[PDB]
Amino acid sequence: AAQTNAPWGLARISSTSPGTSTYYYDESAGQGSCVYVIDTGIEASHPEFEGRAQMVKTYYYSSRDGNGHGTHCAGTVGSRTYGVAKKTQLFGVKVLDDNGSGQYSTIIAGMDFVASDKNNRNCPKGVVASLSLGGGYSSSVNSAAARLQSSGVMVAVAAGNNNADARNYSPASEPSVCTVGASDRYDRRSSFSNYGSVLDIFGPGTSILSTWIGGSTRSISGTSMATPHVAGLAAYLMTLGKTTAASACRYIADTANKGDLSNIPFGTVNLLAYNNYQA
Ligand SMILES: [Ca+2]
């Protein structure tokens, strides 16, 4: 399949070169997979989700996304126009309030929730979780992410937006999950993107158009935006039978565009998420 005039990040993920504008992908499009978006929620009523999104959990007085950032991330995973995996099922877990903040104990509860909740969902092709969040180093936060991964979920987490070594942030610093840095449309490391040995992969993160609340759309930037490209890619690859939750991060790294990003500090992977789709 070909989507013309796609957001640059989608075009990038299906290309051996920057500077193109068509997204190419297998028509299966993540059908039969599921992606949990652990964030501020998802506006499931957005036409872009086509009924494939649902809120499954909140820790607050509402499950509504009163912020937008969860909706944006979910859009990059699986919206019809702005998404990588256009036929995946999206499940929202609201661990962040409408200011985009969340206590680590709530975030941890959300991760353990997903590990159980997948057993209540139909995801024959596999399960992914996208965590566009983080804070300072916490062994408990890392351990929760590790459990989620161990339970059979492909966990993709943001590296962070500190232009610093991600070793000092959680869940970014958890070795067993897929830690995602951000790049721009010119294949530069995004200026805010964290880096370091703990990174596994880069995805498009600067000036990413996606869904927003009130049935709208929005371009924003962050490792928060790169993460759902990788989460959506994992779901897409799992539907194709190319990989599984336990090795999707490895598979993505092994099939990535290599050595093509600029301003990657010595010791950080130079790997850009790539679907290796041949039309
Ligand atoms: Ca790893």
**Structure determined by:** X-ray
Q: Annotated catalytic, 72?
A: no
- In contact, 203 and 227? CB cutoff 8 Å: yes
Distance CA 170, CA 190 (A): 20
> At how many Å resolution was this determined?
1.0
Q: Which residues are annotated as a binding site for Ca(2+)?
A: 16, 175, 177, 200, 260
- Residue 252 CA to ligand 1 center (angstroms) comes to 11
**Angle between the N-to-C axes of helices 223-239 and 248-255, in degrees from 0 to 180, rounded to the nearest 10:** 100
Query: Domain spanning 1-279 has what CATH number?
Result: 3.40.50.200
Which member of 39, 65, 98, 187 is catalytic? 39
- Tokens at residue 168, please? 């000092």
- Asked if residue 100 lies in contact with residue 40, where contact means CB atoms within 8 angstroms, the answer is yes
The rounded Å distance from CA 217 to ligand 1 centre is 32
* 47: preceding bond cis by omega (within 30 degrees): no
Angle subtended at Cα 99 by Cα 96 and Cα 104, rounded to the nearest 5 degrees:
35
Going by DSSP bridges, is the β-strand pair 89-94/33-39 parallel, antiparallel, or unpaired?
parallel
Cα separation, 235 vs 240, whole angstroms: 9
Enumerate the H helices of 151-222 as residue ranges. Answer: none
Angle at CA of residue 275, ends 272 and 52, nearest 5°: 110
Torsion angle, alpha carbons of 29, 33, 39, 45, to 10: 70
The residue extents of the domains of the chain are 1-279
Could you tell me whether strands 53-58 and 89-94 are parallel, antiparallel, or unpaired per DSSP bridges? parallel
**How far, in Å, from the CA of 216 to the mean position of ligand 1?**
35
Q: What tokens were used for 209? A: 């158009």
What residue type is assigned to position 207 of the chain?
S
